[PDB]
Structure formats: C-alpha cells, structure tokens
Amino acid sequence: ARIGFLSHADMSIHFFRRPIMQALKDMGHEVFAIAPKGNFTDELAKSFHAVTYELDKASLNPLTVINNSKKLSQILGELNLDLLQTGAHKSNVFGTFAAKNAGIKYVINLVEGLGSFYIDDDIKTKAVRFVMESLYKISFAKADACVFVNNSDADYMISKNLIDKSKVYRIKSVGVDTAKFDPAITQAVDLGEKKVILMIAQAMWHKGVREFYEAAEILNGYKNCEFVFVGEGFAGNKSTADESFLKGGKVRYLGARNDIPQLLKASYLLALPSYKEGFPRTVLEAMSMAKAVVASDVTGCNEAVKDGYNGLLCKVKDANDLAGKIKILLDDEELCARLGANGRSWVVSEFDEKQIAKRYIEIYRKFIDV
Ligand SMILES: CC(=O)N[C@H]1[C@@H](OP(=O)(O)OP(=O)(O)OC[C@H]2O[C@@H](n3ccc(=O)[nH]c3=O)[C@H](O)[C@@H]2O)O[C@H](CO)[C@H](O)[C@@H]1O
C-alpha cells in the first residue's frame, strides 16, 4: 500500500507513470513520486508524495554514481516502501541496487527505449553499453519483473540473456488520456492559416531535430505549410540543440508548452524523425488527436506507426525522405485524414491510459495486496 515510482526525471513521473499512480491513489494507497527537483515537482507534490534527491543524470563517473546511489538508498529507505517501480536505465539499474540495499522487498523495472547508448557506435559507447548490460543482468536478477512498452526492447534484452522471459511483461505503450486528448472537446491553438507540421520533442539531436529543421528548409512553405517545434533546448550540451539553433531556421519555435492537445488540434500532422524510441507518447498524442504521423522507421516508431495505416515511415538521418513523406501528405489531404482517423481508432481500442494502468496494477497484485 506504499508504492514509490523512481525516475531520473520528474517528467517521466508526471507524463508517463501518472495514470498508474492516480489509479493507486484512488484505491487508497500511499504513492510516492521520486525524482530530482524539476519543473513538475511542485505540481506532482499536490497529487502525490513528492520526494527529491540529488542525481548527476548523465554522469558516468563511478564515485559520483556510487555516492549518488548511496544517498538515494537512504532517501528510499526513509519512505518505508512496499514496492518500487523504476523507469529507464539509471533507475532500473542503480535504483534497484539502492532499493534492495534499502530493504524494499519488491522492485518492478520499466524499459521505455534503449537510449543513445544504442544509437552511438563509437568504441567508448560500446564499452559503456557492455557494462550497463552486464549490470542489468544483476539488477534484473534482484528485481521481480520488468515491464516493456514495446516488443523490440524486450526481444533484444531477452536475446542478450539479460532477463528471463518469466520476468518480461509486455504492456504496449504507457497509455494516453484519450478523453483529454479528444478533438471534439479541444479548441485548436491559433497558429494562422497554415498547414502546421508539428514536432514535439526535447531538442535532442537523437530526436531528429536537425532533420526536422533541414526538412523545413527543403519544403520552404510548400503548399502553405509551416514547421512548428515544441520542446526545450539546453545550452552547453553536445547532445542538444541550443535555442539559437531552434530559433534560427525555417521553423516556428514555441519552446515548452502545456497545451499539447490544442497544438495537435491546430496541426496538420506530427513529425517524429527520432533516431530511436520506445513507444513514443507524442505519436500516441497525435493519434488520439486524429492526426497523421510521419516518423522514422526506427525502433519504437515502427511499432507505434504502421506505414500506410496511421502514418508514414521515413528513413532515419534523412532530411529529404522526411520532407518527401510530409510533401506526400500535403499533396493528398484525403489520405492524411484517413491515416489520422486510423490513428484515433487504434489508440482508443488499445492505448487508453486507464486500461494500461490497470494492467500494471495486476502485476503489482502478484506481489502485494492492492
Ligand atoms: C526512448 C525515447 O527516446 N523516448 C521514450 C520516452 O519518452 P521521452 O522522454 O522521449 O518523451 P516523449 O517525447 O515520448 O514524450 C514527451 C512528453 O512530454 C510532453 N511535452 C513535451 C514537450 C513540451 O514542451 N510539452 C509537453 O507537454 C509530450 O506531450 C509527451 O507527453 O518514454 C516514452 C514513454 O514510454 C516513450 O516510450 C518514448 O519513446
């Protein structure tokens, strides 16, 4: 009845875990949102028990990551948790070690994307990938189960004998609030009289930001289109576009936004030229808003978008092919609407958050009384 949700970032708790956490709260359980201080901490803290901790999120310095995970073990023990749900690599691995050193009997892991350590292929990153996968063998062994939001990550980690099928649970996508993301009750943002080509993402190079911006240059307002980017940059980050880049192209930059349903309602299609995903939630949000998607033919994207059904797949690291798929849909409105309609139909029947949350709780029921 004391269930914590550990993440390296409060955004995962607030956007992804939330439906699970709200379901458990409603059932009368005490629910903990464990993540470093961020932009959603204050909001999270009036819905659940917010707990913050110091985390060097990207650092790979052993002593930093050891000291950090010792402090986290203490922070976690003070919560007297019955079960901990972790998410993503650093929480899955070091969060599990910390949780077990803290006396938490049950730890459920979650993989929602393999990350940039499977995009980059340099020798340094290949070494880091090997260590992480070696530690996963241990954390997965100490943990009781791991949920996977797509099939490819599960297949892969199984193929590498990192985890036994017995513990693999496949719950496709983290779900989307299809009653909130509902065209009929949403008033579009006013972005003009243009065909808005919308990309929602943190400005990671590995999200395809460069390709989205080059594709904007290539189409250059074709058929009265306008590329729009929603998300945050970060200065002094090799892995990220700075605001100067995000504002300096044939793209309208809106920064961070909370009116995503309204922005999607204003848009003509959603683009996600990611280098790698798990089950992208912005794609789900577009589908729920009955909007067609053009996404990269990469892990995750190619499970959330079926080419010719709810969207079009384009080659990765290829600004011209991304522009081509967008042009195709600009050239054929009746097709673009048909794909969006298929997206809305697919999400309502398989990806509404409420049933997805109930399936997580059925996994928890295996170990604790809810
Ligand atoms: C592996 C990877 O690279 N990403 C995965 C990771 O999500 P990411 O961390 O990549 O986030 P995402 O891009 O899937 O989702 C972003 C979330 O933030 C919201 N948002 C974003 C920007 C903004 O200004 N305002 C706003 O509200 C957006 O509506 C969405 O709900 O986990 C997700 C949940 O499973 C998916 O599996 C993604 O594939």
Side-chain angles (χ1 to χ4, degrees), residues 144-195:
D144 303 278
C146 184
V147 181
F148 291 86
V149 310
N150 71 26
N151 279 325
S152 172
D153 302 337
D155 296 359
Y156 173 80
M157 285 184 161
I158 282 166
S159 83
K160 296 276 270 178
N161 213 32
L162 304 176
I163 179 169
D164 187 67
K165 294 148 48 220
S166 186
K167 305 210 211 178
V168 169
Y169 296 82
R170 299 161 188 261
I171 311 182
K172 192 151 249 188
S173 81
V174 301
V176 64
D177 185 359
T178 62
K180 170 175 153 101
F181 283 86
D182 188 350
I185 64 139
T186 310
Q187 180 181 301
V189 167
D190 182 0
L191 299 172
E193 198 250 325
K194 306 251 208 146
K195 305 270 171 227

Short mmCIF file of all heavy atoms in Angstrom, two decimals, residues 144-195:
data_model
loop_
_atom_site.label_atom_id
_atom_site.label_comp_id
_atom_site.label_asym_id
_atom_site.label_seq_id
_atom_site.Cartn_x
_atom_site.Cartn_y
_atom_site.Cartn_z
N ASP A 144 11.97 -8.10 -9.47
CA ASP A 144 10.98 -9.15 -9.58
C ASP A 144 10.32 -9.22 -10.95
O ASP A 144 9.86 -10.29 -11.36
CB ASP A 144 9.90 -8.96 -8.51
CG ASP A 144 10.48 -8.91 -7.12
OD1 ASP A 144 10.73 -9.99 -6.53
OD2 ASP A 144 10.72 -7.80 -6.61
N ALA A 145 10.24 -8.10 -11.66
CA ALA A 145 9.70 -8.09 -13.02
C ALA A 145 10.17 -6.83 -13.72
O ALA A 145 10.65 -5.89 -13.09
CB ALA A 145 8.18 -8.19 -13.01
N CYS A 146 10.03 -6.83 -15.04
CA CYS A 146 10.32 -5.66 -15.85
C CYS A 146 9.24 -5.51 -16.91
O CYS A 146 8.96 -6.46 -17.66
CB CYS A 146 11.69 -5.75 -16.51
SG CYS A 146 12.11 -4.24 -17.43
N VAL A 147 8.64 -4.33 -16.97
CA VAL A 147 7.64 -4.02 -17.99
C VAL A 147 8.35 -3.40 -19.18
O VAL A 147 9.31 -2.64 -19.03
CB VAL A 147 6.57 -3.06 -17.42
CG1 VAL A 147 5.53 -2.75 -18.48
CG2 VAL A 147 5.93 -3.66 -16.18
N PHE A 148 7.88 -3.72 -20.38
CA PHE A 148 8.41 -3.18 -21.62
C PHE A 148 7.27 -2.54 -22.40
O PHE A 148 6.22 -3.15 -22.59
CB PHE A 148 9.08 -4.27 -22.46
CG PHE A 148 10.36 -4.78 -21.86
CD1 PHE A 148 10.34 -5.79 -20.92
CD2 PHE A 148 11.58 -4.25 -22.25
CE1 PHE A 148 11.52 -6.27 -20.37
CE2 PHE A 148 12.75 -4.71 -21.70
CZ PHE A 148 12.73 -5.72 -20.76
N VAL A 149 7.49 -1.29 -22.83
CA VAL A 149 6.45 -0.55 -23.54
C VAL A 149 6.41 -0.86 -25.03
O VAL A 149 5.46 -0.47 -25.70
CB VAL A 149 6.64 0.96 -23.33
CG1 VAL A 149 6.81 1.27 -21.85
CG2 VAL A 149 7.83 1.46 -24.12
N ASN A 150 7.41 -1.56 -25.55
CA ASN A 150 7.37 -2.07 -26.92
C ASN A 150 7.82 -3.53 -26.91
O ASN A 150 8.11 -4.10 -25.85
CB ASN A 150 8.23 -1.22 -27.87
CG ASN A 150 9.73 -1.39 -27.64
OD1 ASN A 150 10.20 -2.42 -27.16
ND2 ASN A 150 10.48 -0.39 -28.03
N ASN A 151 7.87 -4.12 -28.10
CA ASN A 151 8.29 -5.51 -28.23
C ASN A 151 9.77 -5.65 -28.56
O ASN A 151 10.38 -6.66 -28.21
CB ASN A 151 7.48 -6.22 -29.33
CG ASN A 151 6.13 -6.69 -28.86
OD1 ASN A 151 5.96 -7.10 -27.71
ND2 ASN A 151 5.15 -6.63 -29.75
N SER A 152 10.35 -4.66 -29.23
CA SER A 152 11.73 -4.80 -29.69
C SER A 152 12.72 -4.76 -28.52
O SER A 152 13.70 -5.51 -28.51
CB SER A 152 12.04 -3.70 -30.70
OG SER A 152 13.40 -3.68 -31.03
N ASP A 153 12.47 -3.89 -27.54
CA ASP A 153 13.37 -3.83 -26.39
C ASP A 153 13.32 -5.13 -25.61
O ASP A 153 14.36 -5.63 -25.15
CB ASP A 153 13.00 -2.65 -25.49
CG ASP A 153 13.03 -1.31 -26.20
OD1 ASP A 153 13.72 -1.15 -27.24
OD2 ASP A 153 12.34 -0.38 -25.71
N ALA A 154 12.13 -5.70 -25.44
CA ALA A 154 12.00 -6.98 -24.76
C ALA A 154 12.74 -8.07 -25.52
O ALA A 154 13.62 -8.75 -24.98
CB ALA A 154 10.52 -7.33 -24.59
N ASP A 155 12.39 -8.25 -26.80
CA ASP A 155 13.08 -9.22 -27.64
C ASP A 155 14.59 -9.05 -27.53
O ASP A 155 15.32 -10.03 -27.34
CB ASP A 155 12.63 -9.07 -29.09
CG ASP A 155 11.17 -9.39 -29.28
OD1 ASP A 155 10.51 -9.76 -28.29
OD2 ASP A 155 10.69 -9.28 -30.42
N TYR A 156 15.08 -7.82 -27.64
CA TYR A 156 16.52 -7.60 -27.61
C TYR A 156 17.13 -8.06 -26.29
O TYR A 156 18.04 -8.88 -26.26
CB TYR A 156 16.84 -6.13 -27.85
CG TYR A 156 18.31 -5.84 -27.66
CD1 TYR A 156 19.23 -6.12 -28.66
CD2 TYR A 156 18.78 -5.32 -26.47
CE1 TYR A 156 20.58 -5.86 -28.49
CE2 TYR A 156 20.13 -5.06 -26.28
CZ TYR A 156 21.02 -5.34 -27.29
OH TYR A 156 22.36 -5.09 -27.11
N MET A 157 16.61 -7.53 -25.18
CA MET A 157 17.21 -7.84 -23.88
C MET A 157 17.09 -9.32 -23.57
O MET A 157 17.98 -9.91 -22.94
CB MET A 157 16.55 -7.00 -22.79
CG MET A 157 17.00 -5.54 -22.78
SD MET A 157 16.30 -4.62 -21.41
CE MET A 157 17.39 -3.21 -21.30
N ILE A 158 16.00 -9.95 -24.00
CA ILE A 158 15.91 -11.41 -23.88
C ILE A 158 17.00 -12.07 -24.71
O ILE A 158 17.71 -12.96 -24.24
CB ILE A 158 14.51 -11.90 -24.31
CG1 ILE A 158 13.48 -11.64 -23.21
CG2 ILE A 158 14.55 -13.38 -24.66
CD1 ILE A 158 12.05 -11.79 -23.67
N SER A 159 17.14 -11.63 -25.97
CA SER A 159 18.13 -12.23 -26.87
C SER A 159 19.53 -12.18 -26.28
O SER A 159 20.33 -13.09 -26.51
CB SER A 159 18.10 -11.54 -28.23
OG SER A 159 18.89 -10.35 -28.20
N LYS A 160 19.85 -11.13 -25.53
CA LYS A 160 21.14 -10.98 -24.89
C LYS A 160 21.19 -11.62 -23.51
O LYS A 160 22.11 -11.33 -22.73
CB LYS A 160 21.51 -9.50 -24.81
CG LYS A 160 21.70 -8.82 -26.16
CD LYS A 160 23.11 -9.04 -26.70
CE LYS A 160 24.04 -7.92 -26.26
NZ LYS A 160 25.43 -8.15 -26.74
N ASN A 161 20.22 -12.47 -23.18
CA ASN A 161 20.19 -13.20 -21.91
C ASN A 161 20.44 -12.26 -20.73
O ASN A 161 21.16 -12.57 -19.78
CB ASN A 161 21.20 -14.36 -21.90
CG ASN A 161 20.73 -15.55 -21.08
OD1 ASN A 161 19.53 -15.82 -21.01
ND2 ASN A 161 21.66 -16.26 -20.47
N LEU A 162 19.82 -11.08 -20.80
CA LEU A 162 19.85 -10.13 -19.70
C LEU A 162 18.75 -10.39 -18.68
O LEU A 162 18.90 -10.00 -17.51
CB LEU A 162 19.70 -8.70 -20.21
CG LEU A 162 20.70 -8.22 -21.26
CD1 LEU A 162 20.31 -6.81 -21.70
CD2 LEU A 162 22.12 -8.23 -20.71
N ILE A 163 17.66 -11.03 -19.09
CA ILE A 163 16.48 -11.22 -18.26
C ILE A 163 15.75 -12.45 -18.78
O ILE A 163 15.75 -12.74 -19.98
CB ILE A 163 15.56 -9.97 -18.28
CG1 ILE A 163 14.33 -10.20 -17.42
CG2 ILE A 163 15.16 -9.64 -19.71
CD1 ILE A 163 13.50 -8.94 -17.18
N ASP A 164 15.15 -13.19 -17.86
CA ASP A 164 14.38 -14.37 -18.24
C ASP A 164 12.98 -13.97 -18.67
O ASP A 164 12.36 -13.07 -18.07
CB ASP A 164 14.30 -15.36 -17.08
CG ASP A 164 13.67 -16.68 -17.49
OD1 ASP A 164 14.27 -17.42 -18.31
OD2 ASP A 164 12.56 -16.97 -17.00
N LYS A 165 12.48 -14.62 -19.72
CA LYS A 165 11.12 -14.40 -20.19
C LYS A 165 10.14 -14.35 -19.03
O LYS A 165 9.17 -13.58 -19.07
CB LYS A 165 10.71 -15.53 -21.14
CG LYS A 165 11.46 -15.60 -22.45
CD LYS A 165 11.59 -17.06 -22.94
CE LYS A 165 10.27 -17.81 -22.88
NZ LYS A 165 10.49 -19.22 -22.41
N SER A 166 10.38 -15.15 -18.00
CA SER A 166 9.47 -15.22 -16.86
C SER A 166 9.17 -13.84 -16.31
O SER A 166 8.04 -13.56 -15.91
CB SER A 166 10.08 -16.11 -15.77
OG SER A 166 9.16 -16.32 -14.72
N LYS A 167 10.18 -12.97 -16.28
CA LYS A 167 10.01 -11.64 -15.70
C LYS A 167 9.62 -10.58 -16.72
O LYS A 167 9.28 -9.46 -16.33
CB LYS A 167 11.31 -11.21 -15.00
CG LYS A 167 11.81 -12.20 -13.96
CD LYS A 167 12.57 -11.46 -12.86
CE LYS A 167 13.68 -12.31 -12.27
NZ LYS A 167 14.44 -11.56 -11.23
N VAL A 168 9.65 -10.90 -18.01
CA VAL A 168 9.31 -9.93 -19.04
C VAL A 168 7.79 -9.81 -19.12
O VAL A 168 7.09 -10.81 -19.30
CB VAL A 168 9.91 -10.33 -20.39
CG1 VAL A 168 9.34 -9.48 -21.51
CG2 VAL A 168 11.43 -10.23 -20.35
N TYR A 169 7.29 -8.59 -18.98
CA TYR A 169 5.89 -8.28 -19.19
C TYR A 169 5.79 -7.21 -20.27
O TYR A 169 6.43 -6.16 -20.17
CB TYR A 169 5.23 -7.80 -17.90
CG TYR A 169 5.21 -8.87 -16.84
CD1 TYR A 169 6.31 -9.10 -16.04
CD2 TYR A 169 4.07 -9.64 -16.64
CE1 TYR A 169 6.29 -10.08 -15.07
CE2 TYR A 169 4.04 -10.63 -15.67
CZ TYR A 169 5.15 -10.84 -14.89
OH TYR A 169 5.13 -11.82 -13.93
N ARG A 170 5.00 -7.49 -21.30
CA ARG A 170 4.85 -6.60 -22.44
C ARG A 170 3.52 -5.87 -22.32
O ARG A 170 2.46 -6.46 -22.53
CB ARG A 170 4.93 -7.39 -23.75
CG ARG A 170 6.27 -8.12 -23.95
CD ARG A 170 6.17 -9.23 -24.97
NE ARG A 170 7.38 -10.04 -25.01
CZ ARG A 170 8.35 -9.89 -25.91
NH1 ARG A 170 8.26 -8.99 -26.88
NH2 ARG A 170 9.42 -10.67 -25.84
N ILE A 171 3.58 -4.58 -21.97
CA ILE A 171 2.41 -3.71 -21.91
C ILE A 171 2.68 -2.59 -22.91
O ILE A 171 3.47 -1.68 -22.64
CB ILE A 171 2.16 -3.16 -20.50
CG1 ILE A 171 2.20 -4.31 -19.49
CG2 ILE A 171 0.82 -2.44 -20.45
CD1 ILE A 171 1.92 -3.89 -18.06
N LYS A 172 2.02 -2.65 -24.07
CA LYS A 172 2.39 -1.78 -25.17
C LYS A 172 2.01 -0.34 -24.87
O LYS A 172 0.85 -0.04 -24.58
CB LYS A 172 1.74 -2.26 -26.47
CG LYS A 172 2.31 -1.58 -27.71
CD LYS A 172 2.22 -2.47 -28.93
CE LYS A 172 3.62 -2.92 -29.37
NZ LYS A 172 3.63 -3.65 -30.69
N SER A 173 3.00 0.54 -24.94
CA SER A 173 2.85 1.95 -24.63
C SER A 173 2.51 2.17 -23.17
O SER A 173 2.01 1.27 -22.50
CB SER A 173 1.78 2.60 -25.49
OG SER A 173 0.50 2.34 -24.96
N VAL A 174 2.78 3.39 -22.69
CA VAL A 174 2.39 3.79 -21.35
C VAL A 174 0.98 4.35 -21.30
O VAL A 174 0.51 4.76 -20.23
CB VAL A 174 3.39 4.84 -20.80
CG1 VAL A 174 4.79 4.26 -20.77
CG2 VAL A 174 3.35 6.10 -21.66
N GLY A 175 0.31 4.45 -22.44
CA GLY A 175 -1.05 4.94 -22.49
C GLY A 175 -1.13 6.45 -22.66
O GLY A 175 -0.21 7.20 -22.35
N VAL A 176 -2.28 6.89 -23.16
CA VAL A 176 -2.59 8.30 -23.34
C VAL A 176 -4.02 8.54 -22.87
O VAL A 176 -4.89 7.68 -23.02
CB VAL A 176 -2.40 8.74 -24.81
CG1 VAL A 176 -3.37 8.02 -25.71
CG2 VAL A 176 -2.57 10.25 -24.93
N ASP A 177 -4.27 9.72 -22.32
CA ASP A 177 -5.61 10.08 -21.85
C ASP A 177 -6.46 10.45 -23.06
O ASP A 177 -6.48 11.59 -23.51
CB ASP A 177 -5.53 11.23 -20.85
CG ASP A 177 -6.88 11.56 -20.23
OD1 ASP A 177 -7.88 10.90 -20.61
OD2 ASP A 177 -6.93 12.48 -19.39
N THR A 178 -7.17 9.46 -23.60
CA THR A 178 -7.95 9.68 -24.81
C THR A 178 -9.19 10.54 -24.57
O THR A 178 -9.75 11.06 -25.53
CB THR A 178 -8.36 8.34 -25.41
OG1 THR A 178 -9.20 7.64 -24.48
CG2 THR A 178 -7.14 7.49 -25.72
N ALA A 179 -9.62 10.69 -23.32
CA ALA A 179 -10.71 11.61 -23.02
C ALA A 179 -10.21 13.04 -22.92
O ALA A 179 -10.96 13.97 -23.25
CB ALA A 179 -11.40 11.20 -21.72
N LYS A 180 -8.97 13.24 -22.47
CA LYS A 180 -8.37 14.57 -22.52
C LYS A 180 -7.93 14.91 -23.94
O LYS A 180 -8.22 16.00 -24.46
CB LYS A 180 -7.19 14.67 -21.56
CG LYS A 180 -6.35 15.93 -21.71
CD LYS A 180 -5.27 16.01 -20.63
CE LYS A 180 -4.06 16.81 -21.10
NZ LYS A 180 -4.03 18.21 -20.57
N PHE A 181 -7.20 14.00 -24.58
CA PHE A 181 -6.77 14.17 -25.97
C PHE A 181 -7.91 13.75 -26.90
O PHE A 181 -7.90 12.69 -27.52
CB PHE A 181 -5.50 13.37 -26.25
CG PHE A 181 -4.25 14.00 -25.70
CD1 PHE A 181 -3.86 13.78 -24.39
CD2 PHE A 181 -3.47 14.82 -26.49
CE1 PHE A 181 -2.71 14.36 -23.88
CE2 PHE A 181 -2.32 15.41 -26.00
CZ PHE A 181 -1.94 15.18 -24.69
N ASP A 182 -8.91 14.62 -26.98
CA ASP A 182 -10.14 14.35 -27.72
C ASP A 182 -10.44 15.53 -28.63
O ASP A 182 -10.74 16.63 -28.12
CB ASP A 182 -11.30 14.09 -26.76
CG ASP A 182 -12.55 13.61 -27.46
OD1 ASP A 182 -12.60 13.66 -28.72
OD2 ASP A 182 -13.49 13.16 -26.76
N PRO A 183 -10.37 15.35 -29.95
CA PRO A 183 -10.61 16.50 -30.84
C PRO A 183 -11.92 17.23 -30.58
O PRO A 183 -11.97 18.46 -30.65
CB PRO A 183 -10.60 15.86 -32.25
CG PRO A 183 -9.78 14.63 -32.10
CD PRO A 183 -10.02 14.13 -30.69
N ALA A 184 -12.99 16.49 -30.28
CA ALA A 184 -14.32 17.09 -30.21
C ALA A 184 -14.40 18.16 -29.13
O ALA A 184 -15.18 19.11 -29.27
CB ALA A 184 -15.38 16.01 -29.97
N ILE A 185 -13.62 18.03 -28.06
CA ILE A 185 -13.71 18.94 -26.93
C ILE A 185 -12.50 19.85 -26.81
O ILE A 185 -12.31 20.51 -25.78
CB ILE A 185 -13.93 18.17 -25.61
CG1 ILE A 185 -12.72 17.28 -25.31
CG2 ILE A 185 -15.18 17.32 -25.70
CD1 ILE A 185 -12.31 17.28 -23.85
N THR A 186 -11.66 19.92 -27.85
CA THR A 186 -10.45 20.72 -27.83
C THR A 186 -10.58 21.88 -28.81
O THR A 186 -11.06 21.70 -29.93
CB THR A 186 -9.23 19.87 -28.21
OG1 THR A 186 -9.22 18.68 -27.42
CG2 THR A 186 -7.94 20.64 -27.95
N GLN A 187 -10.15 23.06 -28.38
CA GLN A 187 -10.10 24.24 -29.23
C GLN A 187 -8.66 24.42 -29.70
O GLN A 187 -7.75 24.63 -28.88
CB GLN A 187 -10.57 25.49 -28.48
CG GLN A 187 -10.54 26.75 -29.33
CD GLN A 187 -10.99 27.98 -28.56
OE1 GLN A 187 -12.11 28.04 -28.06
NE2 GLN A 187 -10.11 28.97 -28.46
N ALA A 188 -8.46 24.33 -31.01
CA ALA A 188 -7.12 24.45 -31.57
C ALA A 188 -6.48 25.77 -31.18
O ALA A 188 -7.15 26.80 -31.07
CB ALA A 188 -7.18 24.33 -33.09
N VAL A 189 -5.17 25.74 -30.95
CA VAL A 189 -4.41 26.98 -30.90
C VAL A 189 -4.55 27.68 -32.25
O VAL A 189 -4.72 27.05 -33.30
CB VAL A 189 -2.93 26.70 -30.57
CG1 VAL A 189 -2.06 27.93 -30.84
CG2 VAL A 189 -2.79 26.26 -29.12
N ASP A 190 -4.45 29.01 -32.24
CA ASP A 190 -4.44 29.78 -33.48
C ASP A 190 -2.99 29.96 -33.91
O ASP A 190 -2.28 30.83 -33.40
CB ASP A 190 -5.13 31.13 -33.29
CG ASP A 190 -5.17 31.94 -34.57
OD1 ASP A 190 -4.66 31.46 -35.60
OD2 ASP A 190 -5.71 33.07 -34.54
N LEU A 191 -2.55 29.14 -34.85
CA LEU A 191 -1.23 29.27 -35.45
C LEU A 191 -1.31 29.79 -36.88
O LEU A 191 -0.38 29.58 -37.67
CB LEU A 191 -0.50 27.92 -35.41
CG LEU A 191 -0.29 27.40 -33.98
CD1 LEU A 191 0.26 25.98 -33.98
CD2 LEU A 191 0.64 28.33 -33.19
N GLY A 192 -2.40 30.47 -37.22
CA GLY A 192 -2.57 31.03 -38.53
C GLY A 192 -3.39 30.15 -39.45
O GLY A 192 -4.09 29.23 -39.03
N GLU A 193 -3.29 30.46 -40.75
CA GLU A 193 -4.00 29.73 -41.79
C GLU A 193 -3.12 28.70 -42.48
O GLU A 193 -3.40 28.30 -43.61
CB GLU A 193 -4.55 30.72 -42.81
CG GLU A 193 -5.66 30.17 -43.70
CD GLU A 193 -5.22 29.97 -45.14
OE1 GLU A 193 -4.42 30.78 -45.64
OE2 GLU A 193 -5.69 29.00 -45.76
N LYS A 194 -2.07 28.22 -41.80
CA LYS A 194 -1.07 27.37 -42.41
C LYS A 194 -1.29 25.90 -42.06
O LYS A 194 -1.99 25.56 -41.11
CB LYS A 194 0.33 27.80 -41.96
CG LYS A 194 0.66 29.27 -42.18
CD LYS A 194 1.69 29.44 -43.30
CE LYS A 194 2.51 30.70 -43.11
NZ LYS A 194 3.92 30.51 -43.58
N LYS A 195 -0.68 25.03 -42.86
CA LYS A 195 -0.62 23.60 -42.57
C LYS A 195 0.53 23.37 -41.61
O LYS A 195 1.70 23.34 -42.01
CB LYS A 195 -0.42 22.80 -43.85
CG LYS A 195 -1.46 23.06 -44.95
CD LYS A 195 -2.65 22.12 -44.83
CE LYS A 195 -3.76 22.51 -45.77
NZ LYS A 195 -5.08 22.52 -45.07
#
